[PDB]
Each structure stands twice: as structure tokens, then as C-alpha cells.
């Protein structure tokens, strides 16, 4: 995930944290791969 997050600000890495955490808490799944792209575009 460190590799795939080129051009991310720390803030955006934090906004990514809440999202993957919420899915992980809600669902038991983290789709890091899916969510970096959703954040790019």
C-alpha cells in the first residue's frame, strides 16, 4: 500500500485509513487496492 500511494498527502493517507478501517470493521474486508483508485479519480 505504501507503494501504490504515490502522490498521496499524509491527510489523504489518513482519509484512506478511516475508509479501509470502516470497511474492515463493518465487513471484515479491506479493499486497499480498490480504494486507492477510488481516491485517485
Amino acid at each position: 500500500a505504501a507503494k501504490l500511494t504515490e502522490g498521496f498527502s499524509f491527510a489523504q493517507l489518513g482519509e484512506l485509513y478511516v475508509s479501509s478501517a470502516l470497511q474492515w470493521h463493518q465487513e471484515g474486508n479491506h479493499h486497499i487496492e480498490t480504494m486507492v483508485k477510488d481516491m485517485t479519480g
Binding site: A11, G14, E15, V18
Partner: protein, 61 residues
Amino acid sequence: KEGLFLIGTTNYPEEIDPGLMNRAGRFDRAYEIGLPDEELRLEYMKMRGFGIFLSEGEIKN
């Protein structure tokens, strides 16, 4: 803060501070409240009381 739910409201979203938006910790989601389609317009007229003086057909119309 520890326990505040914020609800902001605007008719002029263009004039919102963009910094308000899409940060967790300050307005994580925005919702557009649009004009009603027919089904919603008809639902409104029913709960509002148009039925007091209009038939089911006059309300559909």
C-alpha cells in the same frame, strides 16, 4: 470535540469554503436535495392535505 455531529446547509454550494469538504473531521459526506419528481410531488400533496378538497384523480392530475 468528542461527540459533535455537524449539519451544514447551503443554497450556494459554489460559495462554500472548499476546505470544508471531503475531510474526515469536517463534513465527510455531502447530499444533494433536489427537486421532486412526479412520484414525490404526489406523495407530498397527499401528506400535505390536498386530499381534503381534491379527488384521487385531481391529485394525480
